[PDB]
Design a protein around this ligand. Structure first.
Ligand SMILES: Cc1cccc(Cc2cc(=O)n3c(c2[NH+](C)C)SC[C@H]3C(=O)O)c1C
Ligand SMILES: Cc1cccc(Cc2cc(=O)n3c(c2[NH+](C)C)SC[C@H]3C(=O)O)c1C
Ligand code: NA
Ligand code: NA
Ligand code: NA
Lengths: 236, 229
């Protein structure tokens, strides 16, 4: 990702060092008075919320490289009571107080544009997810999650599109945003397996019916085509 | 809205003029290769997607003042095949080709940041809506929509907090598995349709079932939230 690589260089040019995080650590949390801009450079994370109940909700997944901002750029206050949790074994991120991101973007329109364009990708992603859920319910959500895993981590092989993510991480991620390990989601995923949309072979998982995923997550498929055309193109 | 007024000033001094649109017009559309930045100054709109078979999906609502961009600021290509449909009787909008926008956000950081903040407000709004639906289902979604309408358009009257939208606009907003939720809300005294208007009589109930949207509105719109808290 050339744009992201230039942004990493711009951060280091202004003296910002990478931090390392491990699975289950919070890169930012909902109780901190200070908000941050996170440039997630490598790894996989999830945005989480807590209900008055104490119940944790998984709201959104992010993978490096991407930008996640916990506060509004102008007011510097929280956009929501959210935590950013690491789900890969390790992650690398740049952690910038929001006031400082402002100074940085204001002196380079190219990098300003890069961060702005990430928010635009988020916005459209959410609408696409909403449209697919509206049409196909949880099946649409789950096919969309698998579709984006296929595009991002998939490699064509004789046995189909191999998902190149450790099995440990990959099973977690098959579960769409929402409550953790829902019974209903498990039964949707294993039904896709039973119908050989995604199959276990020689210790790996292979997507064998990409067209099925595309059929039930059509708006996320359009989203990926429009937002990430080269990655989309590889497998279409 | 002072940030919105300052942005309006900056546009008009850079030659960009307000356009008036009537109900049902598309300020931008899903078949147009040219993408746009819309500064919706006044009125109510909805983002839609129309399928091959004619089915119209309602995806998002917006009210002036707000910013809606149909294209990516860097590539200038579509963010999704969407229309922006006017649902108020009239709307006023500043329509900027996306290539031209880049030049003007460049020369004024303050306005760049205003537009940037709008995207953040949309992102967090979508997440909050998702969160309330995950917790409380369709009841959460409907309470949330009623809650935001109460904060933004509500007027205190002897009959309760009247949602002061042109009746015609209320139909456009959706007012039959939904039909059974509205009836339940009337039965439990949470709302009433009196005469030609809509009245909220138990605001705590709405807040109860749309907690994450309420939190969103507190965080994003503190002055407005504060009028009824
Ligand atoms: C690991 C994972 C699985 C499903 C969905 C997502 C969200 C996601 C993936 C993705 O590839 N991109 C985005 C998202 N969302 C944050 C919209 S924004 C554009 C693109 C990118 O990362 O460049 C993930 C991470
Ligand atoms: C007419 C309407 C009804 C329900 C929900 C919305 C969305 C909405 C309302 C709102 O007041 N605000 C936003 C939205 N969404 C566009 C996030 S962004 C922050 C705030 C504002 O208007 O400044 C609407 C318009
Ligand atoms: Na925080
Ligand atoms: Na291709
Ligand atoms: Na368009």
């Amino acid at each position: 990702n050339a744009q992201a690589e230039e942004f990493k260089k711009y951060l280091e040019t202004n003296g910002i060092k990478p931090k390392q995080f491990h699975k289950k650590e919070l890169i930012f949390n909902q109780w901190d008075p200070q908000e941050y801009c996170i440039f997630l450079y490598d790894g996989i994370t999830k945005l989480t919320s807590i209900s008055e109940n104490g119940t944790i909700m998984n709201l959104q997944y992010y993978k490096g490289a991407f930008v996640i901002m916990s506060g509004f750029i102008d007011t510097e206050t929280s956009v929501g009571y959210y935590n950013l949790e690491v789900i890969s074994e390790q992650a690398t991120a740049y952690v910038i107080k929001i006031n400082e991101l402002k100074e940085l973007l204001s002196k380079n329109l190219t990098h300003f544009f890069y961060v702005f364009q990430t928010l635009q990708k988020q916005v459209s992603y959410s609408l696409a997810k909403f449209n697919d859920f509206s049409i196909n319910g949880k099946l649409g959500s789950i096919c969309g999650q698998l579709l984006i895993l296929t595009y991002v981590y998939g490699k064509e092989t004789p046995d189909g599109i191999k998902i190149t993510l450790d099995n440990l991480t990959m099973q977690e991620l098959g579960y769409s945003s929402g409550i953790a390990h829902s019974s209903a989601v498990s039964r949707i995923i294993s039904k896709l397996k039973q119908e050989k949309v995604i199959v276990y072979k020689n210790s790996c998982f292979y997507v064998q019916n990409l067209d099925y995923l595309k059929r039930y997550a059509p708006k996320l498929d359009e989203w990926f085509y429009l937002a990430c055309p080269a990655t989309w193109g590889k497998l279409n």
